[PDB]
Each structure stands twice: as structure tokens, then as C-alpha cells.
Amino acid sequence: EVFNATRFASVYAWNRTRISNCVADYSVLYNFAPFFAFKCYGVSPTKLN
Amino acid sequence: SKFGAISSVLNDILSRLDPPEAEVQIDRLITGRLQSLQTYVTQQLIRA
Ligand SMILES: *[C@@H]1O[C@H](CO)[C@@H](O[C@@H]2O[C@H](CO)[C@@H](O)[C@H](O)[C@@H]2O)[C@H](O)[C@H]1NC(C)=O
Ligand SMILES: *[C@@H]1O[C@H](CO)[C@@H](O)[C@H](O)[C@H]1NC(C)=O
């Protein structure tokens, strides 16, 4: 749901969200992403699951 | 003691970052722990 919202808010009012009580599978993130920038700092993007 | 790194737990830093980026963190941990061990050994030698 977070990825195919049709009205991503502008930067000046950066809309927040909360992700809790769920199983984070980032394969869906990979699927819904012609990735251009996936620079991960505090964690390795390969090892997320 | 984190010793100037992200985490103070070897198991979790290993399980969080990939080798070619976590090598810096583990090297920092190694330096700190080796320095502490050297201090301990020197103090033990003096007391002995
Ligand atoms: C930021 O983006 C969120 C993700 O879409 C919005 O949450 C949704 O809000 C709608 C309407 O309230 C709910 O029906 C839906 O279940 C989801 O919670 C959120 O509203 C949005 N922020 C603002 C201020 O609108
Ligand atoms: C949103 O959901 C539709 C449903 O099929 C999907 O085709 C689309 O790729 C999704 N978009 C994103 C950005 O996840």
C-alpha cells in the first residue's frame, strides 16, 4: 500500500506512516521498484529478511 | 563498549552488515579489544 499510493506528498510536508505487527518481506519492495537508488547505510540491503 | 562502532556485539554486527562494509566495524572492535587486553596483561605482569 505504501508503494502504490497515487498522491505521494511533497517534501515540505513529508507524510509519515507506521509499520508494526507484520512480517517485513522486501522481495515485494524489489518487485515494485525499477531501482535507481538503493543506498543502505545502517544495514546491508542484501541481508534484510 | 562500542569502541566507536555501530554495535558492541560481534554476532549482531555480523548479522546486520555484509562483510565488505562491516570489515571496518569489526576492525575497530578488534583494535579496542586488543588494546584492552594489552592493558590487562601489562597490569597483570606488574602485579605479578
Ligand atoms: C500518509 O500515507 C498513508 C498511507 O496511505 C495514509 O494512511 C492511509 O490513510 C487513509 C485515509 O485516512 C486510510 O484509509 C488508510 O487505511 C491508510 O491508513 C495517511 O493518511 C497519509 N497521511 C495523511 C496526513 O493523509
Ligand atoms: C500497485 O498495485 C498494482 C496492482 O496490480 C500493481 O500492478 C502495481 O505495480 C503496484 N504499484 C506499486 C508502486 O507497488
A21: region left, alpha or beta (phi > 0 left; psi from -120 to 50 alpha): left
| Ligand 1 neighbour A48 (Cβ under 6 A) | no
Indicate the SS3 state at residue B18.
coil
How determined?
A: cryo-EM
Q: Could you tell me if B10 lies within 8 Å of chain A, comparing CB atoms?
A: no
Question: What grid cell was written down for B32?
Answer: 579496542
Tell me how far apart the alpha carbons of residues A28 and B7 are, in angstroms, rounded to a whole number: 29
Residues of A in contact with B21 (CB under 8 A): 44
The set of residues, in sequence order, having a beta carbon less than 8 Å from that of B7 and lying 6+ positions away, is: B13, B16, B25
Lining residues, ligand 2, CB within 6 Å: A 3-4, 32
Indicate the SS3 state at residue B27.
helix
Residue nearest ligand 1's atom 4 by CA: A2
Q: 3-state SS of chain B: helix, strand, coil percent to 5?
A: 70, 0, 30
Alpha carbon separation from B22 to A38, A41, A44, B15 (Å, rounded): 18, 11, 9, 10
